[PDB]
Each structure stands twice: as C-alpha cells, then as structure tokens.
Scaffold this active site. Structure first.
Site, PDB file in Angstrom:
ATOM      1  N   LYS A 109     -30.700  43.110 -22.421  1.00  0.00           N
ATOM      2  CA  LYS A 109     -30.928  41.931 -22.728  1.00  0.00           C
ATOM      3  C   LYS A 109     -31.999  41.007 -21.952  1.00  0.00           C
ATOM      4  O   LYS A 109     -32.668  41.612 -21.104  1.00  0.00           O
ATOM      5  CB  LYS A 109     -29.480  41.126 -22.359  1.00  0.00           C
TER       6      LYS A 109
ATOM      7  N   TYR B  48     -23.612  40.067 -33.355  1.00  0.00           N
ATOM      8  CA  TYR B  48     -22.622  39.691 -32.932  1.00  0.00           C
ATOM      9  C   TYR B  48     -21.598  38.882 -33.931  1.00  0.00           C
ATOM     10  O   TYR B  48     -20.798  37.787 -33.524  1.00  0.00           O
ATOM     11  CB  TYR B  48     -22.922  38.392 -31.759  1.00  0.00           C
TER      12      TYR B  48
ATOM     13  N   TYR C 157     -18.766  30.238 -27.776  1.00  0.00           N
ATOM     14  CA  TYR C 157     -19.929  30.591 -27.006  1.00  0.00           C
ATOM     15  C   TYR C 157     -21.073  31.223 -27.895  1.00  0.00           C
ATOM     16  O   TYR C 157     -22.167  31.497 -27.429  1.00  0.00           O
ATOM     17  CB  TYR C 157     -19.873  31.681 -25.748  1.00  0.00           C
TER      18      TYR C 157
ATOM     19  N   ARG D 258     -19.909  52.609 -22.030  1.00  0.00           N
ATOM     20  CA  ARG D 258     -19.203  51.356 -21.904  1.00  0.00           C
ATOM     21  C   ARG D 258     -18.579  51.625 -20.477  1.00  0.00           C
ATOM     22  O   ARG D 258     -18.665  50.224 -19.941  1.00  0.00           O
ATOM     23  CB  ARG D 258     -18.170  51.392 -22.883  1.00  0.00           C
TER      24      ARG D 258
ATOM     25  N   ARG E  95     -22.965  46.012 -14.394  1.00  0.00           N
ATOM     26  CA  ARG E  95     -22.455  44.565 -14.192  1.00  0.00           C
ATOM     27  C   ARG E  95     -22.121  44.389 -12.979  1.00  0.00           C
ATOM     28  O   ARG E  95     -22.416  43.217 -12.258  1.00  0.00           O
ATOM     29  CB  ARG E  95     -21.716  44.072 -15.447  1.00  0.00           C
TER      30      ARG E  95
ATOM     31  N   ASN F  72     -25.428  39.047 -18.742  1.00  0.00           N
ATOM     32  CA  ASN F  72     -24.757  40.251 -18.360  1.00  0.00           C
ATOM     33  C   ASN F  72     -25.687  41.364 -18.797  1.00  0.00           C
ATOM     34  O   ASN F  72     -25.100  42.320 -18.728  1.00  0.00           O
ATOM     35  CB  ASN F  72     -23.505  40.246 -18.844  1.00  0.00           C
TER      36      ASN F  72
ATOM     37  N   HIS G 159     -25.968  45.161 -23.519  1.00  0.00           N
ATOM     38  CA  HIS G 159     -24.942  45.476 -24.609  1.00  0.00           C
ATOM     39  C   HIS G 159     -24.778  46.996 -24.759  1.00  0.00           C
ATOM     40  O   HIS G 159     -25.795  47.796 -24.803  1.00  0.00           O
ATOM     41  CB  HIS G 159     -25.416  44.911 -25.875  1.00  0.00           C
TER      42      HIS G 159
ATOM     43  N   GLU H 162     -24.059  48.956 -35.550  1.00  0.00           N
ATOM     44  CA  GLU H 162     -24.933  48.451 -34.762  1.00  0.00           C
ATOM     45  C   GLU H 162     -26.324  49.103 -34.674  1.00  0.00           C
ATOM     46  O   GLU H 162     -27.678  48.603 -34.927  1.00  0.00           O
ATOM     47  CB  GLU H 162     -24.521  48.227 -33.241  1.00  0.00           C
TER      48      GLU H 162
HETATM   49  N1  LIG Z   1     -16.360  34.075 -22.718  1.00  0.00           N
HETATM   50  C1  LIG Z   1     -17.345  34.805 -23.193  1.00  0.00           C
HETATM   51  C2  LIG Z   1     -17.431  35.784 -23.790  1.00  0.00           C
HETATM   52  C3  LIG Z   1     -18.570  36.410 -24.285  1.00  0.00           C
HETATM   53  N2  LIG Z   1     -19.772  35.778 -24.110  1.00  0.00           N
HETATM   54  C4  LIG Z   1     -20.775  36.497 -24.528  1.00  0.00           C
HETATM   55  C5  LIG Z   1     -21.234  37.818 -23.413  1.00  0.00           C
HETATM   56  C6  LIG Z   1     -20.749  39.118 -23.959  1.00  0.00           C
HETATM   57  O1  LIG Z   1     -21.998  39.995 -23.802  1.00  0.00           O
HETATM   58  C7  LIG Z   1     -21.052  38.747 -25.670  1.00  0.00           C
HETATM   59  C8  LIG Z   1     -20.279  39.570 -26.548  1.00  0.00           C
HETATM   60  O2  LIG Z   1     -18.755  39.544 -26.029  1.00  0.00           O
HETATM   61  P1  LIG Z   1     -17.948  40.616 -25.838  1.00  0.00           P
HETATM   62  O3  LIG Z   1     -16.540  40.055 -25.490  1.00  0.00           O
HETATM   63  O4  LIG Z   1     -18.174  41.594 -26.970  1.00  0.00           O
HETATM   64  O5  LIG Z   1     -18.333  41.280 -24.442  1.00  0.00           O
HETATM   65  P2  LIG Z   1     -19.267  42.692 -24.001  1.00  0.00           P
HETATM   66  O6  LIG Z   1     -20.865  42.349 -24.228  1.00  0.00           O
HETATM   67  O7  LIG Z   1     -18.774  43.809 -25.136  1.00  0.00           O
HETATM   68  O8  LIG Z   1     -18.835  43.082 -22.623  1.00  0.00           O
HETATM   69  O9  LIG Z   1     -20.373  37.293 -25.884  1.00  0.00           O
HETATM   70  C9  LIG Z   1     -19.553  34.635 -23.439  1.00  0.00           C
HETATM   71  O10 LIG Z   1     -20.976  34.342 -23.326  1.00  0.00           O
HETATM   72  N3  LIG Z   1     -18.503  34.047 -22.867  1.00  0.00           N
HETATM   73 MG   LIG Z   2     -18.754  43.756 -27.462  1.00  0.00          MG
END
Ligand SMILES: Nc1ccn([C@H]2C[C@H](O)[C@@H](COP(=O)(O)OP(=O)(O)O)O2)c(=O)n1
Ligand SMILES: [Mg+2]
Ligand SMILES: Nc1ccn([C@H]2C[C@H](O)[C@@H](COP(=O)(O)OP(=O)(O)O)O2)c(=O)n1
Ligand SMILES: Nc1ccn([C@H]2C[C@H](O)[C@@H](COP(=O)(O)OP(=O)(O)O)O2)c(=O)n1
Ligand SMILES: Nc1ccn([C@H]2C[C@H](O)[C@@H](COP(=O)(O)OP(=O)(O)O)O2)c(=O)n1
Ligand SMILES: Nc1ccn([C@H]2C[C@H](O)[C@@H](COP(=O)(O)OP(=O)(O)O)O2)c(=O)n1
Ligand SMILES: Nc1ccn([C@H]2C[C@H](O)[C@@H](COP(=O)(O)OP(=O)(O)O)O2)c(=O)n1
Ligand SMILES: [Mg+2]
Ligand SMILES: [Mg+2]
Ligand SMILES: [Mg+2]
Ligand SMILES: [Mg+2]
Ligand SMILES: [Mg+2]
Lengths: 134, 133, 133, 133, 134, 134
Positions: free
Chosen positions: B9, B50, B58, B86, B103, B113, B116, B127
């Site tokens: 990212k 996404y 968000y 993961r 992370r 974060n 992905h 994807e």
């Molecule tokens: N509360 C949240 C949840 C997700 N996000 C953003 C950050 C995440 O990397 C992406 C995708 O969310 P997801 O729940 O799939 O989380 P991952 O990237 O798989 O760990 O959305 C956010 O900014 N705030």
């Molecule tokens: Mg995800």
C-alpha cells in the site's frame, strides 16, 4: 535527477535475495518509477541488453544464465542515480567488490552477480527502452 | 499449492518499507508469479478491489488513501499461501495485531496498514483477475 | 493520541541492545517527545518509579539493578501508545513473553528484562512527572 | 539452569539460514556449551534421535531428509532452556507456527522445518548423549 | 580515550532512521556519555555549531534544515572516537560516501545527510561545550 | 576452490556476535567444511596458531585473550576463499578497518578483533592442520 535501469537477476530469486537488494536501494532513498516482473525474459531481450558483449567468450553462458529464472526490471530515479547505484552495486569481480556493496556482501561469482545497473546516461536511455519500450 | 493477491500500500512507499514487507514474505519461501508497479492505481480498480466495503463509512477515505501514492500488486504462490500470508499480515486493528506480524511490528493505524492480502480462495481468484486480467 | 513513559534498562546498555529496542518502537511509528540519558539514575527516582513494589520481596534487588548502569527515560507519543508499547514489550516472565515481543526475543530473566513501559493512563502521567518534572 | 539439544537441519544450510537461526537463540542470551558440524549425519544416529517416530508414516522421508545435507548439533544452556527454545522454534505445522517464531517466520513445510529442539528434560538428556556421547 | 559530539539530524527523525544510526555506533562499541533530545534546537545554538560556515552560500538553508525537526545531541566516548566515528559517518558528498558508512548506505543529499560528528579534538571540545555547556 | 581457517574469538562470544560474524560469511555463499567448538582452547594450540608472533610484545596478552572464553574454529570453502574472507574480515587496526567489513563495523580494538582468517594458502594449510589435525 536521472533514471537508471536495474535488473534483479535470476540468482537473487534462487537465493531469496530479492528484497535484500531492493531494500538497499530503497534505504538510499531512490524511487521506483517503473517495474516489471519477468517469469523468464525472452532471450532476444537479453541479447539486446548485453549487445556490447556479443563477441565475449562468456556471451552465451551469460544469456543462458539470464533466462534461467525470473528477473525484475526496475527504473530508479534520483539525483545522480546512475553513478550512485553503480557504487552500491559493487565491482563485477568478486576479488574486487567491496564489503558494504551488494556484490561485496552477497555475490561470490563474476557471472552470478545478482544485479545489473546502467553504467552511463547513454546506456540507461538504451536499457530503459529495451525493458520499458512504452 | 495456492496463489494469493497481495497489495503493497501507499504508506509502505512513503515510509520506505516496501522491501521490508516483501522480504518477510520471501523469507517464508513464497514465490512471486506476477507483479506490477502502479505509480497510481486507477480509482475503478481500487473500488472494484474493495467492492465489498462500498457502503461502509470508511470507503471513500480508503479509496482516497489507496490512490494517494504508488502500489505494487503481487501474486504469491506456495502451499496454503492464502491463510499463511494472512497470518503474516496481522489483524487490521492496531490494538490487536501481534508483534511478529507485519502490521503488529510496523503499522500504527487501522487504515494506513501497509499491506492487503486475499482472505480466501474465492476472493484470491477475484482479486487476481482485477490486477492481472 | 497518548504519551507513555519508557525506561531503557541497564541490561540493554550492558548487552548493546539500546538501538535494537528503540528501533522496534520507532518502526511502529511512535515519536519521541522527551528523552534523558542517566549515567546513573538517583536511587530516590527509582524507588518512586517503582513505589508500588516497595514491600515486594524483589524491591531492593530491583532498585539495585536499576542503578547498576545507565538508563534512558523516554516519553513516546502516538495513538494508544500506552497499550501498544506494552504489547511490544512482552510479559515480565520469560516463560510467557511471546516471540516477536522485545522481551520474548531478547530477555531471559524476570528481572533483567530490558525495558519499562507505563501500564495505564494514570501511571503514565505519574511516571512522566517523575522523569520529566 | 538447563541444557537442551538443538539440531540445525539440512534445509537451513540449503537456504543459508544457519546464522539467522543460531542468532535468534544467541540474542535470547543462551550459551553454546557443545557444538558439532556433520557434513552428513550417520543414518543410525538420525534413526536413534527420532526413534519415537520409527513406526510413523513419515519416518523414512524424515530420515532421508535429515541425511540430505549437513547438520549442526548444539547443546544450549540457560535457565529453562528447554521450554524457552521450544517456544522460539514454533509449531511443527506451518498452519500453526506463530510469526515471531523461527518456523513461523522462516519455514513453509511440516517436514522441512529448519530446527530440532528437545521437548523435555528426559528427551534432552537422551538426545545430548546421542550427539555428544 | 576521546569524546566526540554527534548530532542526529532532523532528517533521521523524518525518515525513522534514529535507531539505525545510533545502532551502528553502538555496535562498534562506543559508549554514550551524555545525550540530549531537542524538539527543536534554538537557531542560535545551530549558528554557533556551524559558525565556521557562516559565510558559505548554504549557511541559511543549513540552519533552517537543522531547526526543521528534532535533533539528538550525543557525546560518545572511546579510543580514537573522533576519527573512528567520522569514518563510520562517511563523506558529506553523496557522490563520495562509501557503501558501508551511514551516509553511504542511507543519505542521498549533501545537506540532508543524517548525522554530524566532530572532525577533530579541538572542534569536539568546542561542540561538546555548545550542546552540553554544564 | 580453496579452504581457509577462521576462528571466532572469545570476544564474539562475550558480545554475542557469533551469528553476526558467521552470517556475514554465510551470506557471501561460503560453505562450512568442518567446524569445532572449544569451551577453551589449550594454550599450546593458540601458541602454535600464533607461532609467527612469538617474539612480539603482545604475544602473551594475545594468548591469554584467546584462552579467555570459547572459540569456534571453522574451515570455509569457496573460490578464492582465503583472500575473500580476509577482505570481509577487515584490517587489524581499528583506525584502518573499513565500514562494511566485520572489524570495520564491529571491532574497536587491535587485539579484541573478533575473528581470525588465514592470510595465504601456505598458512591456511598450516592452520587447518592445527585445528583439524585429522
Ligand atoms: N474500520 C475500518 C475497517 C477497514 N478499513 C480499511 C482498512 C482495511 O485494510 C480495508 C479493508 O478492510 P478489511 O476489514 O477487509 O481488512 P484487511 O485489509 O483484510 O485486514 O478497509 C478502515 O479504514 N477502517
Ligand atoms: Mg479484506
Ligand atoms: N569476465 C566476465 C565479465 C562479465 N561477465 C558477465 C557478468 C556481468 O554482469 C555481465 C556484463 O559485464 P560488465 O563488464 O558490463 O559488468 P557489470 O555487470 O556492469 O559489472 O557479463 C562474465 O560472466 N564474465
Ligand atoms: N517476580 C518479580 C516481579 C518483578 N520484578 C521486577 C521486574 C519488573 O520489571 C519490575 C516491575 O514489575 P512489574 O510486575 O510491574 O512488571 P513489568 O516491568 O510491568 O512487566 O519488578 C522482579 O524482579 N521479580
Ligand atoms: N506429520 C509429520 C510430523 C512430523 N514430521 C517430521 C518433522 C518433525 O520435525 C519430525 C519430528 O516430529 P515432531 O512431532 O517431534 O515435531 P517437532 O520437530 O518436535 O516440532 O518429524 C513430518 O515430516 N510430518
Ligand atoms: N556543499 C555543502 C557543504 C556542506 N553543507 C552542509 C551539510 C554539512 O553537514 C554541513 C557542514 O559541512 P562540513 O563540510 O563540515 O561537512 P560534514 O557534516 O562534517 O561532513 O554543511 C551543504 O549543505 N552543502
Ligand atoms: N599490534 C598488534 C598486532 C596484533 N595483535 C594481535 C591481534 C591479531 O589478531 C593477532 C595476529 O596479528 P596479525 O598481524 O596476524 O593480524 P590479523 O589477525 O591477521 O589481522 O595479534 C595485537 O594485539 N597487537
Ligand atoms: Mg555493464
Ligand atoms: Mg509495571
Ligand atoms: Mg520432537
Ligand atoms: Mg564538519
Ligand atoms: Mg594473521
């Protein structure tokens, strides 16, 4: 501000040194401008990249090695990037490459030497056009 | 043997952690089988990537962040690559991500974060077709 | 956004792990907002810092150890800094500290354990006023 | 204070991870008290080392792998060395080994898993006498 | 046995290289004698530190940069610490600083060059008195 | 293809730099051919290893230091291993050893200098026979 062409060679993949090499350039604050992953580069591209070496006795072994596994081609950008990345790379010969350089720390053969970097402005333009003709 | 789709990212570029992140996956013996550098990913690819979050509060900030700098999209191959990467990635929430994870060690925000990783066989296939059509 | 008080303990100096420990916190994106080097911390500051343990069997040995070499006191700032740095630190007991944590990777003793980190908002405020009055 | 027997397995040599693995144990402050390099361990020592698994389906492949390249046998000493180094090692199964552990970070196979560590006081004593009679 | 004055410059904080730089000196077995963290050093201290450069065209840009973020000042002690830390530091110029040095591996600009170190016994005494007048 | 004799000295154990030093040689792609751990080497072995130094004023201090903690003796094999490992080692003198080398990054004393490596084919044969007489 210059752009140089870097290849990560198949030996870096075989030895899992891809990130190590890229990390050294990244830590020196050079920016990736373009990047391409090649599962195997076409021999013709390799022959063009090394056209100046076509009459050297190692030419065919060098081409065989360069198509022996993946390569990453990368264009890096930064002030004096060409000469600077060459200094990070280190000398071709394992009897000469300095500790602290990529080859000095990591490479032990004059052929399997992990990394290519353009040696001049003229050749960078050339090599960038080979790997990124767009 | 599985293939999974990873995005590096824009925060990784900004903080010079691209090699650090890729290195952790490389050291775990996973192999790159495709990779593309995007100086700036097209909004539509990001929104499709996404699409599950499109109605979430968000979403716009997420999409804005994801086009705010370069990304690298990579397909990694290895036995059980999806779940294992993961596991390397760590929890989205910086209150939960374990030290030792990408992370857990490096990220300090639920949004910024770093990485992905596909979360299942079906989403991996989807994807992968978005980034490498 | 929170501030937490960290001590780098004398065993870190002895074993040349000062940068290693500070580096883990820096890589997690936490910012130094105050820092002081003590060639030898005054007994009274140490005893006040650990005043909760003053009746514990290990108190004198703890205080003796803490004045046995240099310490660095640092205030770190970041979102949820207190709990997150506690998570980085790892459990006091070397039978429990997780690999990936500072103590899990580096410490081999319940006493010589490299780092102090404030355990709550109230103790952070107290400890900060002791080291940076 | 305890002694435990560690083997660095042939996959560590093949992937140049010998120092990486030994370094993690050294950084945890454990001391080498014996060490032997085997360009190729004798089949019988290997079969005795793993005698508990002699009727398991994976036994021959395990023994074959263990004689497929060099090994280093090391006795490590430290307080609670046995359990602590087992904790560093990580779970045999790459679906379970935690990031932060040797196997969690580096190993991608239930068989090619880089390191052996004694699992108890009694097995430590036995394994030590096999490698350092 | 000598003491030298080191500054960790604002670019190390911006780039999160503080521990990296301090770690290199720590690994070489130098001991911290004193250390001060500055959220922003007063411009006058900077001007005094760089007084020999007051007539150089870069003087004002250099002072602006040095007050642009935090600095850590450190007194390091060790046999021949002054010359040794200078060799670890690496040359000011990115076209010259050697791979293996702090600047050679990490710095890409002649101005944003991560680290100051005293260059002589005379200047160490001087700089130590500026940053640690006690 | 050559073999060289390396000793990891007692200071590497005291400072927990054993893996660090071995890792640098491992990353350069040299292979361990033999290896022996010594809880304390017998003084006579040390005196034989350093027989060329028997009339130097440091001889006794050097022998005392070498028996002051453990040592690992290692035979490394690789093309030009002798000269190459010497370049990785770095100069004996802390005023000279280059950043990027083992001594340049890690050693701060001319005596406690972490690592021995054979300096020639003749001496490698000799030292290998001392540490691995089999
Ligand atoms: N509360 C949240 C949840 C997700 N996000 C953003 C950050 C995440 O990397 C992406 C995708 O969310 P997801 O729940 O799939 O989380 P991952 O990237 O798989 O760990 O959305 C956010 O900014 N705030
Ligand atoms: Mg995800
Ligand atoms: N004696 C040689 C010289 C070069 N090669 C190979 C290895 C080199 O990377 C390529 C190109 O050689 P060149 O002299 O341009 O060396 P660099 O890669 O720029 O350091 O040829 C070889 O195998 N043997
Ligand atoms: N059984 C114990 C408990 C604590 N100590 C020492 C070591 C600890 O760092 C300090 C403070 O104890 P505390 O339980 O607050 O542990 P932390 O440092 O927060 O993890 O006391 C000890 O030496 N033996
Ligand atoms: N299902 C299995 C179980 C064990 N093995 C191999 C790999 C293991 O390191 C050895 C010994 O098994 P054990 O269950 O004692 O596992 P550890 O090495 O202690 O984690 O056998 C295997 O190849 N497949
Ligand atoms: N041409 C120059 C020379 C120096 N500077 C800045 C950067 C340098 O760190 C300071 C002091 O310069 P000096 O020549 O003493 O260089 P060092 O920091 O000791 O390597 O000035 C500059 O911006 N441009
Ligand atoms: N002036 C000196 C020279 C050598 N020594 C010690 C340290 C050296 O490692 C050994 C052997 O010296 P030699 O000149 O062969 O140096 P190297 O170890 O090969 O770099 O003697 C010393 O203590 N003081
Ligand atoms: Mg060339
Ligand atoms: Mg506490
Ligand atoms: Mg077992
Ligand atoms: Mg100067
Ligand atoms: Mg010699």
């Amino acid at each position: 501000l210059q752009r140089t062409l870097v290849l990560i060679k198949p030996d870096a993949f075989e030895r899992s040194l891809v990130a190590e090499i890229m990390g050294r350039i990244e830590k020196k604050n050079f920016k990736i401008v373009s990047m391409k992953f090649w599962s195997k580069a076409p021999r013709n591209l390799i022959e063009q990249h090394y056209k100046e070496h076509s009459e050297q006795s190692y030419f065919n072994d060098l081409c065989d090695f360069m198509v022996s596994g993946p390569i990453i081609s990368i264009v890096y950008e930064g002030t004096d990037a060409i000469s600077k990345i060459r200094r990070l790379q280190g000398n071709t010969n394992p009897l000469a490459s300095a500790p602290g350089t990529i080859r000095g720390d990591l490479a032990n053969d004059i052929g399997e030497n992990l990394i290519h970097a353009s040696d001049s402005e003229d050749s960078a333009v050339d090599e960038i056009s080979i790997w990124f003709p767009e």
